[PDB]
Amino acid sequence: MTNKEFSDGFSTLLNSFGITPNITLDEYEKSTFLTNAQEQLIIDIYSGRNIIYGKSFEQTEEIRRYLSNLVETYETSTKVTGKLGLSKDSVFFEIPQDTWFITYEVAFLKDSRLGCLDGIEASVVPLPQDDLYRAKDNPFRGPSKDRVLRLDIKSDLAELISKYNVDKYLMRYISQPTPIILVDLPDGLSINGVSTESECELNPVVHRAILERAVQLAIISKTQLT
Amino acid sequence: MNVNEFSNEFDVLYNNIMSNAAPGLNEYEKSVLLTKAQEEIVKNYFEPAGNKYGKGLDDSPKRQIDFSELIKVGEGVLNTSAPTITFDKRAKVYDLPADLFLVINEAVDTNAGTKQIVPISYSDYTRLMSRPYKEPVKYQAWRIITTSINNISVELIVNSNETITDYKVRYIRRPAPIITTNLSSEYGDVTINGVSTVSECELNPIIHSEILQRAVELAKAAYQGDLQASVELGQRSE
């Protein structure tokens, strides 16, 4: 569905300007509620907390077809120099700053010590800080040629603890979806920092579910004190 | 009840039986009062709240027979004779018949079948055109009155890609006046509604007695001539 179709369906479902009591929204309010419904729905889908679906990020074909258009791949070889880490062999990499959740995260290694295995792809294991001390020396869950520990730190950074030098850092995350903005908003206004029209980038399959959730949010907004 | 009897029983009920007889009325005065009573009774009986029963045009057999001899079916003429400015870019202008008192049924015959015309109010127009679709329901059409000169001009709004072939209006004809005698005179021709000749009551004989009674009441109210009578019997003009 397009922005015009989004607005028209929103009005039709809300029974705007009908004879019965009803609710009429501005295009800014329609955009706000559509964006809120979109982001709520995709977060609930990713966490598997939607009772209707009850499935996780890629647990079935339906959810794949829903959130296929947020999956973005990223590559980086630059390392942030001045930072204080929890180990000597700690390197820091920037995050793209539009990430929502990291779903695939792997690290290529370039070191002489692992001879004839150079350029080995290594599995970045997100490790909590409780386990870090007892995982540094762990030969089965600690850093090694086939495994790297990533700890999240401030300023959108990723502290990669490896026994070998880390050359490249690969990611595949869920991106910020573009907001659903149905009209070029006036000066000052914006949704997610976007002022112009913005079409939903997901598939049309989930557009109608987003519309239903946005409508429900609208009625909740108008009918939370009565 | 032809007009000679209208005058004769008007005299009988007005002054011939009074104890202190009032001056007899001229034939022009009787014609004017009878025509006024005719219009007053038509408006009384068309609207339910205008009469004591609370019954309108088709709320009882009597009202049906009352307006039976006044109903007429005519067609609206497409007003492409001259240009004009319609309030709606997609409305076709049609001119209603001249002798139109009240509209009770309208219909339009399109290529996509016949459709009932729903006269939408100025508030319903604003409500409906604020919606995305802005077209009538399946088997109906909308109507709003436009710039009218010498006769009611009408805008018909149908669904897109529909061409109007006929536009029939079932309306209540304007009653002809009740004139007892030829009002032609050497001192000046007077008219009731632009006609001086004898004019019979062209309505069903069922309401002729009511017209006569209302005429007598108007005559006596005029005879008294105080403000109280005029305002009290002016409430029933309606």
Side-chain angles (χ1 to χ4, degrees):
Chain A
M1 303 174 29
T2 64
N3 284 337
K4 182 76 157 64
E5 280 151 89
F6 265 115
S7 67
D8 298 334
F10 205 100
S11 303
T12 311
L13 293 173
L14 264 177
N15 188 223
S16 302
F17 300 115
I19 59 170
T20 77
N22 57 4
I23 287 161
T24 80
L25 259 55
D26 297 332
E27 298 302 80
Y28 174 76
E29 304 203 330
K30 297 205 189 159
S31 310
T32 288
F33 287 118
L34 285 161
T35 313
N36 296 15
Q38 185 186 6
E39 293 179 353
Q40 286 184 359
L41 205 76
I42 62 170
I43 294 171
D44 281 330
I45 285 158
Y46 163 84
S47 45
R49 293 178 292 173
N50 199 326
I51 297 95
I52 298 151
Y53 309 140
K55 303 299 218 266
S56 311
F57 164 50
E58 278 175 347
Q59 184 173 359
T60 51
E61 187 63 31
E62 188 173 2
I63 315 308
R64 286 177 208 270
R65 298 293 102 215
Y66 288 4
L67 311 185
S68 167
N69 277 258
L70 310 176
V71 182
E72 176 59 28
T73 304
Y74 178 68
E75 211 176 40
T76 189
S77 298
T78 52
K79 318 193 201 186
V80 171
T81 54
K83 289 285 157 174
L84 193 152
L86 307 173
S87 67
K88 263 212 170 72
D89 293 358
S90 66
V91 297
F92 307 87
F93 287 92
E94 293 293 329
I95 304 187
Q97 184 177 2
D98 63 358
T99 64
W100 268 31
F101 316 99
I102 310 179
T103 57
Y104 196 66
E105 184 178 1
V106 75
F108 304 69
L109 305 173
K110 207 208 305 171
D111 190 333
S112 86
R113 298 190 271 120
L114 61 84
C116 86
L117 261 183
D118 189 358
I120 190 167
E121 212 177 6
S123 166
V124 164
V125 178
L127 183 63
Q129 310 180 2
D130 285 330
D131 311 337
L132 174 60
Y133 188 84
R134 208 166 286 184
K136 279 155 153 177
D137 273 18
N138 190 288
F140 309 135
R141 311 191 45 266
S144 83
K145 64 183 181 293
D146 63 358
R147 183 172 60 250
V148 187
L149 314 184
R150 182 257 302 188
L151 282 72
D152 300 299
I153 75 174
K154 195 141 54 50
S155 180
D156 303 1
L157 280 173
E159 171 188 358
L160 300 198
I161 315 186
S162 188
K163 188 164 77 74
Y164 300 106
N165 182 67
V166 187
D167 182 19
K168 197 204 290 162
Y169 175 49
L170 199 67
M171 273 175 30
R172 190 169 275 189
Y173 54 92
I174 284 164
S175 173
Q176 183 63 256
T178 66
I180 303 172
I181 298 161
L182 315 177
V183 285
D184 282 345
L185 298 161
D187 289 330
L189 283 189
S190 66
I191 302 177
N192 302 357
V194 184
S195 291
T196 55
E197 308 188 50
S198 296
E199 69 275 16
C200 184
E201 52 175 22
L202 307 176
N203 285 328
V205 296
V206 70
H207 285 173
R208 306 226 175 198
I210 290 162
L211 189 65
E212 294 293 328
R213 174 71 151 271
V215 165
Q216 283 334 290
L217 291 178
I219 317 185
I220 289 158
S221 166
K222 311 298 186 216
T223 311
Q224 58 190 341
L225 302 191
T226 74
Chain B
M1 191 175 48
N2 59 4
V3 291
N4 301 301
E5 303 182 346
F6 265 116
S7 177
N8 290 351
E9 291 83 4
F10 187 95
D11 303 0
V12 170
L13 303 176
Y14 177 65
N15 63 275
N16 291 0
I17 312 173
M18 205 173 295
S19 66
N20 204 27
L25 294 197
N26 214 356
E27 291 296 280
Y28 179 66
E29 304 178 38
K30 291 156 81 162
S31 311
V32 168
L33 293 167
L34 290 158
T35 310
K36 209 187 184 207
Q38 206 190 32
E39 293 179 353
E40 282 196 6
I41 289 282
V42 166
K43 298 184 193 144
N44 273 106
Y45 289 8
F46 180 82
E47 212 286 311
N51 49 33
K52 69 180 200 215
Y53 287 157
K55 293 165 141 63
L57 172 49
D58 276 29
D59 293 358
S60 57
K62 192 185 167 310
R63 295 285 178 272
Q64 300 205 324
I65 304 294
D66 274 2
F67 299 86
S68 65
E69 296 214 10
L70 208 64
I71 286 151
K72 196 172 166 176
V73 193
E75 291 215 359
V77 189
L78 182 65
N79 191 15
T80 52
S81 294
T84 193
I85 190 167
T86 56
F87 189 58
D88 213 39
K89 315 204 307 288
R90 64 221 171 90
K92 310 297 297 315
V93 186
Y94 280 81
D95 302 315
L96 304 197
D99 66 337
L100 188 149
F101 208 69
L102 294 166
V103 181
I104 50 164
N105 271 338
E106 301 176 80
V108 72
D109 205 309
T110 65
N111 54 27
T114 308
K115 299 183 175 230
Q116 294 309 290
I117 281 164
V118 166
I120 54 162
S121 316
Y122 70 100
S123 179
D124 285 332
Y125 189 91
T126 299
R127 185 182 62 71
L128 297 158
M129 311 275 128
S130 302
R131 304 181 71 230
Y133 192 35
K134 310 176 219 153
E135 315 278 340
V137 305
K138 181 71 165 215
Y139 297 115
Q140 304 196 311
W142 288 340
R143 190 263 291 166
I144 51 164
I145 294 156
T146 189
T147 308
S148 310
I149 54 173
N150 312 139
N151 59 335
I152 300 170
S153 295
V154 173
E155 278 171 337
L156 299 199
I157 297 138
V158 291
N159 304 81
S160 43
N161 304 310
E162 310 214 338
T163 306
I164 294 162
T165 73
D166 304 69
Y167 167 41
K168 304 175 175 179
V169 181
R170 182 203 186 208
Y171 58 100
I172 292 163
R173 185 181 62 258
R174 207 208 306 294
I178 310 177
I179 296 159
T180 300
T181 56
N182 190 24
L183 302 172
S184 311
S185 198
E186 301 196 37
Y187 274 69
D189 293 271
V190 292
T191 65
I192 306 303
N193 291 338
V195 65
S196 299
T197 45
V198 173
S199 182
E200 313 279 0
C201 194
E202 60 171 38
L203 280 53
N204 191 300
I206 192 167
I207 57 167
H208 286 176
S209 174
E210 283 94 304
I211 285 159
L212 187 63
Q213 186 71 62
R214 185 67 58 91
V216 172
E217 296 171 19
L218 294 177
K220 295 186 177 286
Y223 193 68
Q224 184 178 2
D226 55 0
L227 178 59
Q228 183 62 255
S230 71
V231 298
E232 201 85 359
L233 275 78
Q235 280 156 16
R236 302 191 316 242
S237 57
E238 301 158 329

